[PDB]
Design a protein around this ligand. Structure first.
Ligand SMILES: Nc1ncnc2c1ncn2[C@@H]1O[C@H](COP(=O)(O)OP(=O)(O)OP(=O)(O)O)[C@@H](O)[C@H]1O
Ligand SMILES: Nc1ncnc2c1ncn2[C@@H]1O[C@H](COP(=O)(O)OP(=O)(O)O)[C@@H](O)[C@H]1O
Ligand SMILES: [Mg+2]
Ligand SMILES: [Mg+2]
Lengths: 592, 49, 226, 55, 590
């Protein structure tokens, strides 16, 4: 037990703490505020407390827990909301009877009263169990069934006794492992330091796509299950809506939605809407909320806790990855994590580096983004999981030259840039098709050739059409459109149609809330066939103005193809699309 | 609504030179347009006659 | 690099050192420099970052007596695609050239997207003479550089002023840019163009122009190869 | 092509036997010079130098 | 005998050292690493070590030498390679027998084993000798046929004994000066502090030009033997190529090629290329390395050596000036000297002033550049020397707003600004004609009236033509070149021809490596005559398009004038241009 020596903002230099470790978790103040040691200058030890510093007196005791900031992995995480340091907000509200979060609440990170059905695994007494091996599973909810119980990493030995099938709480003993003559008792849960990535046997090259549900993201700039993703853009661009839509309609088994610096109203919207929505996975209609946990650390919450929120979320994602699930972390603002880092650095006194962001910001972002990736789990039985980190960067001033944005672009593989010009005029997703890139298009050729062989060719054709139209619009905006060729006019019209109908997706409309991969492929086929038919008809000799006058009906049918509800199914929607191409081909031959 | 130019002193000077040249070209082309418009009005009168 | 030095000199091997993310190395230096609270240079980088980068880079070259060599190709990623950043600036000042990868060319779809104009090789003058390669290497390289610069200027002129205002030379230079970027620079992986084949293709590019327009080509080489 | 490809990857006994001579040579050299090398290491450890720092 | 109290990198802080003086060389460490005391904070004394501090412990002895940074001026330095201090790289390689530089090696700056032929001067025993006077003449090389053994400045007296003509080494005493009672002894060589300018009787106004060989420089932006020039530009741009062009082909009788903050392969290329080239300055053609000294300090050597090499080179050039030789020192990367200064200031903790550079950057650059200028060396016999300082500056990012570039621009008299746009298009020498200037044209009017009377008028005419064509090209870019005047098109075509065939020369090509003053004057006259003929013929009434179609042959001849080989001599080349003027005049009649 030390003492507080200096309190300046979210940092507390506590004296009389010889023996404190780096990033060692402490309890600053009489209310036992959660803090982590940053510097140790002699007996002094600077601490970044993860709570409100108002009211800390010089001389308050500071306890040394002895262990780093440790998330509490285990059953019960899946349908919950956390405060950044893994404090269940429901439990805080129920215990406090107040709409506020009291300073120093020490509620357990996981509900201890709830009894979980336990089904022992293939292991038994005498089997040599290794770190990360599955010695049982628990039924968490209807959607995430068999929440496999993993032996903690770096814990190894022979199984002395295993709990039989039944109902158990988290505090109850579940397993006893003997290592070098010392027995170790294991429960349903286990702690893990958030700073250190959870070990895996061997990471793998991600190849299965992450079906976002947005047309442009799923087609033009695809993302794989197990790859970092960056979403820069100013306020109102659509990063939060893109993230929420990805969490709602992704093919991932679980979601780790992390909000650092995001509004509390976004968290309220997610909590209100996710249970209403349902998924077709697992052979039944179950609420989305049953497979997504939220790490809520809003902007008015303590500054230092944003880093803890990021690390807690990524460690939960790593846990559900080691369970063999396809998880996708969604950090709401890596930029806000970096701004928290800048505030802590400025209060500490380190050198500002660039823009004031600390010099270690790039390394921290690189490590956090390297936590993600498809990997084989650590222990037997063999199972493969993946963590896809899709983090929305928030540049200052709406310019992609911010240090956070530059580091994120350097480290991530997929860059979904957002332009505020399209953020206005209600052109969501406001994806800037010129600067955005995806480096998984090469690896995704296997999946595309397996399922939709014409998908890469159609995507390339649409990309080159968009580039040609960008050049044409650039030249026209200064030199008018009185000298364009018929082919140029066709390109401009078809790309305007693509922007107005295909690329733009109203995520809050029933028809365009979720455009699946097959619908997106069919609509790309429709638009590309329209462009090709127009080009061929005009090259045959037909004037473009007369052709447009005659084929306005076909153009309207193509542009209204987004209204086809995917709820009808793949067979029904594809049946209408096949008739759309056949009618369009006929209406381009009769007109010509 | 801004050119994609990397912020630098050399870039700043180049853009100031570009702005001066753009203003000069604007004035010169407006004066040329005025002269050609006078010539075009004369040509229209001559065409009617 | 000390492993490379050992191999190349004490073992007489021909080492091809490939450093990647020298920008990340410089970021590590900045992290250490910031922690030490030393007086910082541009963008917070240490004032001795030039000396550290020079110590790393200058460990490459041939040595008298030894029959080995070190050929460094440090992959430097400019942070904001700006060559004026301290890391690329000092790296280009220390090293013997640079290969410039262009975001604009990558957007155009050219691989390798090597923007030849900012790229430089200070040893090209001595390594591309007669005997080592064909006698036309230097002249062809200079002529291609001049015509590609003229092509970029003509593209800017076409973008700003009307296309009809472009002269015959400007139109020919636009065509040269199109076929240089879309046929000469575009190579694809595994292509393996020999130096002589690349020179022949470059001549095919230069045969667009009349022999009168090719100023950078010496008259003897122009007569021999055109 | 598939039939020829399968045969190429199965070839590992020849590679294993090729190194088998090297292991025998290493074992022979060790068995020959163990006495000398261990004795000189013992001399070095047993005989220290009571040397004060120059400064 | 002090002791290191702190190291913290290249700047050790030795304690228990009283009586220290600023810029005094101490011997740091047990390996006797040399240094220079740069802050004396009481007993402690911050020291910038010129070698690699790695292993120096707290307690190692530091001893004060009792002398500032001094070079060993004398015979024996006309083909050697020196480090940032003055350490013979060839001797180091031949002694340590290693491809690296041994740490703390102590090799004499001059070879004491070579026996130098000595011939006494007019001074005899009993005469009153003054500092800077000549009392011998050592035959060093074929080019340097008489290395005058100058009496050290600030050392005078009455000659008590002089050695007779014979073969002497660098350690054998040659002269005994009575002085004020204390009979000193003077050998062949003599040391001199590098930060103290060598005394001169009186500096003069440099008149004769330094023929760089490059057409752009030697025609539009001339330099004089004794002038200070700068060649600022980003990496590339041909700063090093221009430096080596003035190193190989120049009117200077000696040269010190300083390479502070330069790649080792640059010095390797100099060492491999210079022995091949020959000049006929003496009676017969002799190699360049017989008149070239390399103060080569690679970029990986300590920043203190980068700081020291500039001063070592400038004081060697001052010595060869004091001998009466027209020297042209070529400093490489003066911006890297400034970067070494900035790094040293940062390690010290002094507050940077401009863009991170130290506040005294301008003062240091002025103190270094002011060492130039034509001057009469003190002492008899009288003889005139010159130190042209052709220093290359490499501003960060290619912007001429850098503090080092601004200070050098304010201090120097000539400025050969280079443009990255012209460099990347391979339009070397890539001289930015709009910004480049020379303040020595007013002085050089006299030499031009003496040798080539029409040169100043032609240079002014070409500058006016280039400026008018730049304005016309801006207007063309603005207004699409609609209905351009015939004279305007003539000026544009002539200036394009001038830029593509007179301001563009391959310094590595055999024909255009060196363009002499006479050849460049003839080419200037040919270009101006072509422009005047076109102007007059069109003013007569001829259409410019038809005139160009008819005179394409003359235009191609003027273009090939750059391909004319200067190796044929003045008589052949001047006659060839006489035909070109005759052909150009013939087209005027047609
Ligand atoms: N895909 C979409 N479909 C329909 N409307 C959208 C879509 N994306 C965004 N919008 C609209 O634009 C608004 C943008 O708000 P959003 O939460 O996406 O902002 P943001 O860029 O994440 O901002 P912040 O940086 O402040 O968190 C939404 O509230 C919604 O009204
Ligand atoms: N006058 C010239 N003639 C021919 N090539 C030149 C000339 N000037 C520069 N270059 C070319 O420029 C390249 C690099 O120039 P350099 O002088 O090394 O740049 P820096 O001044 O940065 O060292 C060289 O490979 C050389 O071929
Ligand atoms: Mg948001
Ligand atoms: Mg150089």
């Amino acid at each position: 037990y030390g003492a507080i020596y200096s309190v300046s903002g979210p940092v507390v230099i506590a004296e009389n703490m010889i023996g404190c470790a780096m990033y060692e978790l402490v309890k600053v103040g009489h209310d036992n505020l959660v803090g982590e040691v940053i510097r140790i200058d002699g007996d002094k030890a600077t601490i970044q407390v993860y709570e409100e510093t108002a009211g800390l007196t010089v001389g308050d005791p500071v306890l040394r827990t002895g262990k780093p900031l440790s998330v509490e992995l285990g059953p019960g995480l899946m349908e919950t909301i956390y405060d950044g340091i893994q404090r269940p907000l429901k439990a805080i509200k129920e215990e406090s009877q107040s709409i506020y979060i009291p300073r120093g609440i020490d509620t357990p990170a996981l509900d201890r009263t709830i009894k979980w059905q336990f089904t022992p695994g293939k292991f038994q007494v005498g089997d040599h169990i290794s770190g990360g091996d599955i010695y049982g599973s628990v039924f968490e909810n209807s959607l995430i069934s068999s929440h496999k119980i993993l032996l903690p990493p770096r814990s190894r030995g022979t199984i002395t006794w295993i709990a039989p099938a039944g109902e158990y709480t988290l505090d109850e003993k579940i397993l006893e492992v003997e290592f070098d003559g010392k027995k170790s008792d294991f429960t349903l849960y286990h702690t893990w330091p958030v700073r250190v990535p959870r070990p895996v046997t061997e990471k793998l090259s991600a190849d299965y796509p992450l079906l976002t549900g947005q047309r442009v993201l799923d087609a033009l700039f695809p993302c794989v299950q197990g790859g970092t993703t960056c979403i820069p853009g100013a306020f109102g661009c659509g990063k939060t809506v893109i993230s929420q839509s990805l969490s709602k309609y992704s093919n991932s088994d679980a979601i780790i939605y992390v909000g650092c610096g995001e509004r509390g109203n976004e968290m309220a919207e997610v909590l209100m809407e996710f249970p209403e929505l349902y998924t077709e996975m697992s052979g039944t209609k179950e609420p989305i909320m049953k497979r997504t946990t939220l790490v809520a650390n809003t902007s008015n919450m303590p500054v230092a806790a944003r880093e803890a929120s990021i690390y807690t979320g990524i460690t939960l994602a790593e846990y559900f990855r080691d369970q063999g699930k396809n998880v996708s972390m969604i950090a709401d603002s890596s930029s806000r994590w970096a701004e928290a880092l800048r505030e802590i650095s400025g209060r500490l006194g380190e050198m500002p580096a660039d823009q004031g962001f600390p010099a270690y910001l790039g390394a921290k972002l690189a490590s956090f983004y390297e936590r993600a990736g498809k990997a084989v789990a650590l222990g037997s039985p063999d199972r493969t999981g993946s963590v896809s980190i899709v983090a929305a960067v928030s540049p200052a001033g709406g310019d992609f030259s911010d240090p956070v944005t530059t580091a994120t672009l350097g480290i991530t593989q997929v860059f979904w840039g957002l332009d505020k010009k399209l953020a206005q005029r209600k052109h969501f997703p406001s994806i800037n098709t010129s600067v955005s890139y995806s480096k998984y298009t090469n690896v995704l050729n296997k999946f595309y050739d397996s399922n939709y062989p014409e998908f890469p060719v159609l995507r390339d054709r649409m990309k080159e059409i968009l580039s040609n139209a960008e050049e044409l619009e650039q030249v026209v905006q200064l030199v008018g459109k009185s000298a364009l060729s018929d082919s140029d006019k066709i390109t401009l019209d078809v790309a305007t149609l693509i922007k107005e109908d295909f690329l733009q997706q109203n995520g809050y409309s029933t028809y365009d809330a979720f455009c699946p991969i097959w619908k997106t492929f069919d609509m790309m086929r429709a638009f590309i066939s329209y462009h090709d038919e127009a080009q061929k008809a005009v090259a045959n000799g037909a004037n473009w103005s007369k052709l447009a006058d005659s084929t306005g009906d076909v153009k309207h049918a193509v542009s209204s193809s987004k209204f086809f509800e995917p709820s009808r199914g793949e067979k029904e929607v594809h049946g209408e699309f096949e008739k759309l191409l056949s009618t369009m081909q006929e209406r381009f031959a009769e007109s010509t | 609504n801004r050119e994609q130019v990397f912020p630098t002193r050399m870039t700043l000077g180049l853009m100031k030179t570009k702005l001066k040249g753009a203003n000069q070209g604007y004035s010169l082309l407006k004066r040329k347009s005025e002269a050609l418009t006078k010539r075009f009005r004369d040509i229209t009168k001559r065409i009617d006659d | 690099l000390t492993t490379a030095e050992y191999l190349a000199y004490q073992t007489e091997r021909h080492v091809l050192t490939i450093l990647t993310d020298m920008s990340s190395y410089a970021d590590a230096l900045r992290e250490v420099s910031a922690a030490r609270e030393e007086v910082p240079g541009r963008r917070g980088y240490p004032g001795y970052m030039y000396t550290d980068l020079s110590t790393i880079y200058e460990r490459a070259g041939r040595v008298e007596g030894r029959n080995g060599s070190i050929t460094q190709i440090p992959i430097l990623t400019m942070p904001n695609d700006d060559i004026t950043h301290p890391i690329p600036d000092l790296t280009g000042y220390i090293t013997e050239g640079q290969i410039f990868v262009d975001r604009q060319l990558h957007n155009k779809g050219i691989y390798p997207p090597i923007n030849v104009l900012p790229s430089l090789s200070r040893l090209m003058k001595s390594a591309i003479g007669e005997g080592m390669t064909r006698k036309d290497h230097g002249d062809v390289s200079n002529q291609l550089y001049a015509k590609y610069a003229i092509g970029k200027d003509a593209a800017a002129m076409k973008a700003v002023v009307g296309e009809e205002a472009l002269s015959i030379e400007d139109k020919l230079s636009l065509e040269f840019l199109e076929k240089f970027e879309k046929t000469f620079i575009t190579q694809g992986a595994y292509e393996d163009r020999t130096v002589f084949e690349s020179l022949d293709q470059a001549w095919s590019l230069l045969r667009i122009y009349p022999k009168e327009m090719l100023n950078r080509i010496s008259p003897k080489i122009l007569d021999e190869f055109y | 092509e598939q039939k020829n490809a399968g045969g190429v990857g199965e070839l590992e006994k020849k590679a294993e036997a090729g190194v088998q001579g090297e292991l025998a040579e290493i074992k022979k050299i060790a068995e020959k010079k163990k006495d000398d090398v261990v004795k000189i290491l013992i001399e070095t450890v047993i005989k220290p130098s009571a040397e004060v720092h120059i400064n």
